[PDB]
RNA sequence: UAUCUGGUUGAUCCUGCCAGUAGUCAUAUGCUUGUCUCAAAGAUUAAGCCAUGCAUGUCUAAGUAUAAGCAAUUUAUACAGUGAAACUGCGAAUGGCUCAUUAAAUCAGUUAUCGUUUAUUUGAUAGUUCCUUUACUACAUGGUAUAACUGUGGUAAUUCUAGAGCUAAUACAUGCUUAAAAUCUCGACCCUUUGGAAGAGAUGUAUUUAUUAGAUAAAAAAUCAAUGUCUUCGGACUCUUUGAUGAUUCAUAAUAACUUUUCGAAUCGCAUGGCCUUGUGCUGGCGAUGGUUCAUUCAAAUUUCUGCCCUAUCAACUUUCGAUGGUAGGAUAGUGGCCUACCAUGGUUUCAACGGGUAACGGGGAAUAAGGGUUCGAUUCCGGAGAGGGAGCCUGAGAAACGGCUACCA
RNA sequence: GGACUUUUACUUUGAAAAAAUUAGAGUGUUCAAAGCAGGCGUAUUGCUCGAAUAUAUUAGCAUGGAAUAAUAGAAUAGGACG
RNA sequence: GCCCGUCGCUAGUACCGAUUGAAUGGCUUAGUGAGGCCUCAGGAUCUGGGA
């Protein structure tokens, strides 16, 4: 049952190292590695299984496979990607397209549909507006708070000639 | 040992808090803060164990998360929030307002004070540098970035504070005779004066204090957090004001209010 | 990790085991007093024992010194309280006289007899420990 | 991991010291970036909580700046003529603080004639006024002015490039290059 | 020990950041930079007068001389720019009630604006780790030469 | 709570030990055992070995839901309740346990950081991001590639997983933006003066280097090179601005540049209101999660002074292969022979070094009660060390981690 | 703020100081070992005393003393004040 | 009367001692040297020089 491993080459096995994103391996905890076994790439006679992807089809269909079509499982749920699951340029609105999928509760039939994201909305608008609000009001805050404190100082000094003239 | 420690030893628990020796095993640690670990008052300690509102510590969290209680004018939802001296502690509902300060014999008072009193509070300035943008800034003792200070503030002064708005409404200086609550060793709790400090330099500066008892002690300067003009305190002072009586004094007052 | 539960004990006992002079004279403080015990004299005498070492402590210092005159004070007025010192001799050179008998006399088996209620020592034990 | 401990190594008595614990991370040590010339090659390393350093490996060009003049410019580093830690790193051209390289002159010229009008060695209206108003300050420095001619600068790398990814210093002057001139020589 | 040459290593030694502008004609050649360390102790003269570098000067280079002022009295002057003193006290010894004779050698360096030698009591301060050993600086020598003056030829 | 007694002789007085006597938070064992309360407990020998179960997981209105999940109703045809799985985040460095090592080590009391790192809590903190700066850059918001899942599978076997097909973000990877002003360098022109000028670029923070300011020990003058502000055109400069420390090349700022360019919100929940030129325009409430720098708090690492049991049937020790010091570097979070290169010959010791032993973790403390002492402390709190023995390292703020991984040994 | 100070031991008083343990105050856990409680009323919408003190010695710090015991001083005057 | 040593018996302890005897633990020369980490290369594939 041991996997093959893309470009070990050898036609054996060896027990390598593997880490986060790497082919059989699966991490149970951050910054594991582990030391396990592997098939290498070279095809033998030893596999149980070889792994095939048709890439050009025969003169002939293959029973289950040419004849019958499975299909895809989830659509697009990101707000361009619906765009481009059907290509849309941004001013035909995302809301419509998005898919449905019928559903059955015994004698009613109801029906969903995702959650787009990255969906630009008016709330999202109202934020962009505040923060930018917020720094320039700030900033605006900032410099008074300066220049009242510039004062401070300078009629301090218009004490400082007041002492000096006194005595 | 590998980390921070998250847990607080009952016995290994400071005194002042006058926890229990049985009944458990642990005291609750009190979670980073303003204050100090060992010079402060946990929230759960304080509704709990000096205010006996709630029984169980479970209590202390669900009187908390309906945030009743608010530190210093901000709400605080933390159980083991370290409270600590000079702030202000109050409940919304039971229009009650406390300050935290100390007794004489070391402890945290529980001690009322009033609706107006709990606008503002008073902070002893611990440091005083140059900050970025060439903006002068004080510090005080519980960890305050105020902006913009008067010159004349330096450090040992103390300074009041609008809690309200973060600002400061004025300062004290540290001067031969100005009011003086003393915040460490065992002469914690003490109030007077001052009468001159000792100056020794490369460690430790010796304040020589004088109450009105004509008492006298010292402590280190560190220790020492000035509050007013002799008579006129800038907070309100604990029955008591701090001037502790011997041993013989105390038993003699306790056996003076006898008669039923 | 619990703190310790702290505890004492409340006795001690004869330097010497066979001295017969002692065994008799420690008899009749219970054939009078209606004790079991050995340790119930035993337990009295340590009682006693300590309270001389802090008054012969006390003693030492300075008339009118602080601790003295506290601490002093205090265990006296602590003794006249169950009746073991009298008011006169209220100053502890006296409490350092102060035999056995004095603390003895002032059991509740020995006043449930004293007045009434007992007649005989023993059946002033039985009807306390009897509810 | 290299440990930076003292618990090894005898005691002045000259006493041979126990084991006592193992090594711990916080008294680590990593090794030498041992930077070279030529082409950008740097790897950050992770060092104590959070907090990069960057190791410079290969390295050609640096910023130098000419201190009496006020400037500094970006040049490549010819590279490594002299260095008083270990001569393998001379002749093994590599680049450590303190190490004494040859730079490049070629920015440092075209800096100069243009803010001098003067041209080292052997017509706007502004310039001529801005250059008229400079010199008795363009009278250099016999000892600098004469390294032009070989397109090569004498300088002291100042900063640390297993540390920092940079390898950046002054050019030489005045006392400290007469130094490094007799040493060069007077071994040559 | 310095003494002589000065410019004696592989390198150049200087005071940082202390730049001497060559096109600046000066009349110091060297311009040198120097502190007051504080808690009183004078900078001698030989310090700012000198030019030796040493950066582990306690008035010419860079440390900090914070913690304890210790004086003892030199016994070594063999290792280069560094001393070792001896501080003697005596130990009480309860159960006795008397007291035993004891000592500790101390290494510490000493900047070349004293010349210090065997025999003479130093006030030395204490400073960051300077060597291996090294954790005091040398700040005022109390003593002198003891006497040694007066030990010349026959009347 | 300052006590002694029995035994050498024929008898005597001594010396002197053996024996008795009393306690022990001092262990065992024997016999005996009713009640209240209190409650230590596989330390000692073997830090020997370990079957099986359990001891670390975690969700708020508020990061991610098309469960082909549950519930239906209640406005909700993008989503909206509730919610497995999974991603993402945070935690697993606390706790608990043991006393093997350890004899100037640890530890204690006392110091130091002007010698550093610090998740977090708390408080401060960001108008500068583009481009030779009119035929313009997604901001009404830019890119895919993946779990779960569906489906095809492999092995006797494990918290093994492979090939195929989908789809999210506060995961990954990108990438716009804002007032005014001043100061700088350039400089087209015109005109000879005392010379002045349109307009052009550059200036967030962070990084790295070099430079400068950061005064003050009481007062005054002349001259060289540049070159400021005001002219009563010989000239004057009149008031001139300064933080902290015992102490700094400190805090902070200024100049010329540097960077495979750090940060500068493409995030989320509640409410939905004003406002006119009716753009679904422009505005706008409360608070979540972030975020760079500084402070604070929880810390950490090193560190000064002094103090340790027996031992000379241990007297010299230390530099092989660093032993003690100097210079430079490298490395580190950072000091430092920590490591390297050059150079030197130093460092400790009868005031006991160095070596040996320890049935040695250090401390708070425990037992014994005239006092002085003597003995003990594996063990409820504090510090330290370890996880069968060694070494190594990934992740991370923090581990040289063991209920993490890698290798060797058993 | 400048300019400079012969060294030490001893003793004094003081600061800095974890708790539990120890000594010891207050409180009738029914007694007691303990514990840090508890106590008063209008016992129907509260009043109130507490949670002491001592010790903590060596070393380091800070202060007073000037006996006891060391130390250094001016003799080839290279002396002291100005 | 006391009493000393060889010689003889039982039993016990410790010593010397061919075996260049044995065992456990701590360091350690020389040789061999796993592994991760750093680094010179590499390039299955998978994209805009990088990974
Ligand atoms: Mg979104
Ligand atoms: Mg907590
Ligand atoms: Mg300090
Ligand atoms: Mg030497
Ligand atoms: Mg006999
Ligand atoms: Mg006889
Ligand atoms: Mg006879
Ligand atoms: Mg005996
Ligand atoms: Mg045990
Ligand atoms: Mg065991
Ligand atoms: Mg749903
Ligand atoms: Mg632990
Ligand atoms: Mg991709
Ligand atoms: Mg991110
Ligand atoms: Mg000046
Ligand atoms: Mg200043
Ligand atoms: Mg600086
Ligand atoms: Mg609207
Ligand atoms: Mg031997
Ligand atoms: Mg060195
Ligand atoms: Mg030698
Ligand atoms: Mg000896
Ligand atoms: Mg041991
Ligand atoms: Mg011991
Ligand atoms: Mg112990
Ligand atoms: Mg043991
Ligand atoms: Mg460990
Ligand atoms: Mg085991
Ligand atoms: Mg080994
Ligand atoms: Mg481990
Ligand atoms: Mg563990
Ligand atoms: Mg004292
Ligand atoms: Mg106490
Ligand atoms: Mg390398």
């Not at chain 1, 003169?59 to 059907?86: C, H, M, S, W, Y």
């Not at chain 2, 590998?2 to 002042?16: I, Q, S, T």
């Not at chain 4, 070629?106 to 310039?127: C, D, I, M, V």
Request: net charge positive; glycine share 6%.
């Amino acid at each position: 049952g041991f996997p093959m491993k893309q470009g070990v080459l050898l036609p054996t096995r060896i027990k390598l190292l593997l880490t986060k994103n790497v082919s059989c391996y699966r991490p149970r905890r951050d910054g594991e590695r582990k030391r396990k076994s592997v098939r290498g790439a070279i095809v033998g006679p030893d596999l149980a299984v070889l792994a095939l992807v048709i890439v050009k089809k025969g003169e002939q269909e293959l029973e289950g496979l040419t004849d019958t079509t499975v299909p895809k499982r989830l659509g697009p749920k990101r707000a361009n990607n619906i765009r481009k699951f059907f290509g849309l340029s941004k001013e035909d609105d995302v809301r419509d397209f998005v898919i449905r999928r019928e559903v059955t509760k015994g004698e009613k039939t109801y029906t969903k549909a995702p959650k787009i994201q990255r969906l630009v909305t008016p709330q999202r608008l109202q934020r962009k507006r505040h923060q930018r609000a917020l720094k320039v009001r700030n900033a605006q805050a900032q410099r008074e708070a300066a220049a009242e404190y510039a004062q401070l100082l300078a009629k301090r000094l218009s004490e400082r000639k007041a002492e000096k003239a006194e005595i | 040992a590998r980390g921070p420690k998250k847990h607080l030893k009952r016995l290994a628990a400071p005194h002042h808090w006058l926890l229990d020796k049985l009944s458990g095993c642990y005291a609750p640690r009190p979670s980073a803060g303003p204050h100090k670990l060992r010079e402060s008052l946990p929230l759960i300690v304080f509704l709990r164990n000096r205010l006996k509102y709630a029984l169980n510590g479970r209590e202390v969290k669900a009187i908390l998360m309906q945030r009743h209680v608010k530190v210093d004018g901000k709400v605080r939802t933390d159980t083991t929030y370290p409270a600590g001296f000079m702030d202000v502690i109050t409940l919304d509902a039971t229009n009650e307002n406390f300050r935290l300060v100390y007794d004489v014999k070391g402890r945290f008072a529980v001690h009322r004070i009033t609706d107006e009193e709990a606008s503002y509070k008073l902070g002893k300035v611990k440091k005083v540098q140059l900050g970025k943008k060439g903006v002068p800034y004080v510090v005080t003792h519980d960890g305050r970035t105020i902006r913009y200070p008067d010159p004349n503030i330096k450090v040992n002064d103390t300074v009041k504070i609008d809690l309200a708005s973060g600002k400061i409404t004025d300062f004290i200086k540290f001067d031969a005779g100005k009011l003086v609550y003393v915040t460490g060793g065992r002469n914690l709790g003490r109030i007077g004066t001052i009468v001159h400090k000792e100056r020794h330099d490369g460690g430790f500066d010796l304040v020589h204090i004088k109450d009105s008892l004509d008492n006298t002690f010292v402590t280190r300067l560190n220790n020492v957090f000035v509050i007013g003009e002799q008579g006129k305190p800038y907070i309100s002072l604990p029955k008591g004001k701090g001037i502790k009586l011997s041993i013989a004094e105390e038993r003699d007052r306790r056996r003076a209010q006898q008669g039923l | 990790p619990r703190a310790p539960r702290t505890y004492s004990k409340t006795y001690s006992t004869p330097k010497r085991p066979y001295e017969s002079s002692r065994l008799d004279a420690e008899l009749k403080l219970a054939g009078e007093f209606g004790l079991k015990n050995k340790k119930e004299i035993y337990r009295i005498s340590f009682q006693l024992s300590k309270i001389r070492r802090a008054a012969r402590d006390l003693l030492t210092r300075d008339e009118k010194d602080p601790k003295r005159l506290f601490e002093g004070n205090a265990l006296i007025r602590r003794l006249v309280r169950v009746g073991v010192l009298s008011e006169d001799k209220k100053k502890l050179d006296y409490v350092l006289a102060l035999k056995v008998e004095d603390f003895l006399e002032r059991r509740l088996q020995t006043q449930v007899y004293k007045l009434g209620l007992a007649k005989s020592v023993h059946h002033a034990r039985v009807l306390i420990t009897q509810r | 991991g290299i440990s930076r401990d003292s618990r090894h190594k005898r005691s002045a008595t000259g006493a041979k010291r126990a084991q006592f614990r193992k090594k711990r991370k916080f008294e680590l040590g990593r090794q030498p970036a041992n930077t070279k010339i030529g082409a950008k090659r740097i790897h950050s390393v992770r060092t104590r909580g959070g907090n990069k350093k960057y190791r410079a490996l290969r390295i050609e060009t640096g910023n130098f700046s000419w201190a009496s003049e006020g400037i500094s410019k970006k040049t490549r580093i010819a590279g490594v003529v002299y260095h008083p830690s270990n001569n393998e790193l001379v002749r093994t051209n590599t680049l450590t603080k303190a190490a004494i390289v040859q730079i490049d002159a070629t920015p440092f010229r075209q800096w100069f004639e243009a803010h001098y009008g003067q041209t080292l060695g052997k017509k706007s209206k502004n310039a001529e006024r801005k250059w008229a108003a400079r010199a008795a300050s363009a009278k250099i420095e016999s000892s600098v002015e004469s390294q032009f001619s070989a397109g090569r600068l004498y300088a002291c790398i100042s900063s640390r490039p297993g540390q920092s990814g940079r390898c950046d210093g002054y050019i030489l002057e005045g006392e400290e290059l007469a130094f490094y001139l007799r040493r060069l020589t007077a071994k040559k | 020990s310095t003494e002589l040459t000065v410019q004696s290593e592989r390198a150049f030694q200087k005071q940082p950041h202390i730049f001497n502008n060559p096109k600046v004609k000066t009349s110091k050649r060297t311009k040198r930079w120097y502190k007051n360390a504080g808690l009183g102790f004078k900078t001698p003269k030989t310090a700012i007068e000198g030019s030796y570098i040493d950066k582990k000067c306690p008035f010419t280079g860079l440390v900090s001389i914070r913690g304890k002022i210790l004086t003892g009295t030199v016994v070594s002057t063999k290792m280069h720019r560094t001393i070792v003193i001896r501080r003697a006290y005596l130990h009480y010894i309860p159960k006795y009630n008397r007291y035993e004779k004891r000592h500790k050698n101390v290494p510490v360096h000493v900047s070349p604006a004293f010349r210090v030698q065997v025999g003479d009591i130093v006030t030395v301060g204490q400073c960051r780790p300077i060597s291996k050993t090294v954790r005091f600086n040398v700040v005022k020598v109390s003593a002198a030469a003891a006497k040694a003056n007066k030990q010349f030829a026959k009347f």
